[PDB]
């Protein structure tokens, strides 16, 4: 079990190589057997290791949220625990009835008192691409149905039993 | 070896760190009658030092948060009052005699520098905390016998020990 | 088994920990029309991300030098236009549109710390360029099929790889 | 081997642990007539060394407390006199002769930075220095042969050693 | 192995980690018709490098004393264009045309941070400038067939290698 | 092997990383005439340069003590010469011809950070110094053939070595 996790770890994510401010997306499977307690330990870790907003840097960054394969009535509801707990984010809707704002997600990613960026669907996540000039990774970690990601991207894969091993690997 | 007890428990549900990151951390540490006073007095100045920083160099501080159960109220009191004599500042609510729970003096002691950790006094206290801390709660138990119920909502780990001294090199 | 390649060819001619002086290093990759843009890029990034002092501590800064060959002009000014477009600039020795090679920008980038790294078109402005650097200079060429023809000259190692793929982990 | 019986002493009986923290640590150590007064002072200076931090750096201070039983006072007081001569300033609560015992003159000297460490005489000043100290105290225990009654609320740590010559490396 | 027999080369003959002080180190090279230009300059490169610390934070400044022997003198002015060519800017007691040698200007480029090695003509100038450096010397003397005389108070060591490439490993 | 011989000495009594004090070491070497006076040299260097602190940034500095034993004056005073040409600027308590032995300039070249260690020519000079210093004294003894008679009341340790060569790799 822990050999498993080991190989995960060291042949694809490759923490401490990589520190240069890009557009970092983790997309990660949300299903309704997980729950929303785990998938919170997930994000809390994915955000304390792929984001720098310590005042000493010049250049911030933020990690990009996407989550695929669940409700938006538990979507929206760990989207509403994380505001709570103080994990600021954006995801292009700065208020009630807006369109999606691409620039909303680009000032965030350098902004220092917004932790990470989620990203509601698809549609929000393609739209978003298009939007970021600098080099952007792709980083899809799933159970069952994996993501349709655009070919020019930099995507990696990563297949786990649950989404609980999700947040050693990261 | 009872050193492979201690290091197979201090990896498989504490971490060493957690990032070092400003947490409600709650340590829930399971007193006995038969546990000796001064025994619980190094676990709790063993998670004082680890998992708090009061550091002056810090603008984002944190204390972790201290609750009881399974002993009488005689040697509750007493322990606490052996904590305050030896300048380790904690608070629980209660600045006054006859106060009702003030939770939100545990909510400022949390991020005070003077004030080491939180104590709280039982589970009316310690459920009337959660709901006042609006940041990441985390919940750590460590018992022998008698397991304490958690709200399904929080992350916790729960621990067997053999005794109350093996905590102590745990955390 | 199968990591020992990889590990191999670091040692054996290429280390980062040594080579902290600013020295005109060329970098030459085999653009064989048979990967795509992307792997060309992760390749690239590394090799800025490791040859280069940027960084506003340090008084003498440096940049690699970045050639390809085997390929067409249509994906070279592909992979170019997207590079650009990534705040990865770089200069080739073309300040303008219609102009002749100017190696002195070429000169000024590779101590300029907004300038990331330096193009090179073809072996034409590949040769005329190592007559207008004075300093040291080091050529690492990494191919699969067709290798270039470096002058004997100047320091050389040469990498055969089984596919581009092996270039960005080995620098 | 000799090594590795105090490797697992240096480990396990006693560690580092939690260091760097002001507390009043008790050093007991047996000094008998066949150990001569040249292993004591090596073994004095290591505790010093180790167990207090003066720097001008920190703001929280602490010395170590040495306590010695089993011992004439003719070679206790030849050994006070070579520390204090070569500049070991110490304190033992008599800062002049005739002089009744003050533990406040070890309040003080436990947080002064020009005053290395703490002696202690007999069981009769260890007692009375338990009392006036508030903060947290450790009593770490060397022996050989007889060892010494400490108080039950206190955290004791107890080490029989082969010889004194062994303490130097223990702690 | 090549890779086993580098590292005893390495490891016994020279240590680099201790040698860190401003000592007047000779450095000799054996020189030979069959052996490239090219090759010797990543050893001059090398030991420049590793053996100056000419770094702005220092006041105790240090550079590496280069001879070369075995050689003619056309390709020996042929290495000295080269390296001065590529700002390896050093001294080598001809400030001028027609000058006599002066071990002055060996005196202070080894002091100076803008003079990064000392080049060293002949023996007759090895041995003029060996009166002149009061401090102490060391002479570390790369050969292959032919060895020097090197003068018997002086702390000299000797390797003997198969060529000149793999000198630049073992400094 | 031969290594491992130098390995058990260096560990089983000196280490560089226990001490790091200003005591007032001293380093007893034999000198008995079949070994020449350069590789005495070295082992003074090491002696010096591993035993001292002299930065600006301490303001506690220690030089080392050395006294040599066994040889004739006309290379003891033959030594001193070649130190003090090369820079090694020490003190021996005669400040002029005629002086009788001054102990105080063995005191205040002890922490003086422009001496860079102290002298000792023979064994009424060391015995006198003792008693000039309060500071805790240790005596570092290395010898081939005939050992020094040290007094009993400091901490000393003997060390018999093959050869001469061998004492700079245990310092």
Do not use: Q
């Given at each position: 079990r822990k050999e498993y996790l080991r190989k995960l770890k060291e042949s694809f994510i490759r923490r401490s190589v990589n520190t240069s401010p890009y557009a970092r997306f983790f997309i990660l499977e949300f299903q309704?057997?997980?729950?929303?307690k785990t998938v919170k330990d997930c994000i809390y870790k994915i955000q304390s290791n792929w984001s720098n907003l310590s005042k000493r840097t010049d250049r911030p960054y933020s990690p990009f949220l996407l989550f695929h394969g669940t409700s938006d009535a538990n979507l929206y509801e760990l989207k509403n625990q994380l505001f709570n707990e103080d994990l600021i984010f954006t995801?292009?809707?700065?208020?009630?009835?807006?369109?999606?704002?691409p620039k909303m997600l680009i000032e965030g990613f350098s902004?220092?008192?917004?932790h990470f960026q989620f990203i509601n669907d698809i549609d929000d996540f393609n739209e978003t691409l298009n939007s970021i000039n600098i080099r952007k990774e792709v980083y899809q970690f799933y159970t069952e149905n994996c993501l349709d990601i655009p070919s020019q991207l930099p995507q990696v894969n990563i297949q786990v039993?649950?989404?609980?091993d999700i947040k050693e690997i990261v």
């Open positions: 309704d057997k997980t729950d929303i995801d292009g809707y700065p208020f009630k009835g807006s369109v999606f704002t902004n220092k008192e917004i039993k649950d989404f609980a």
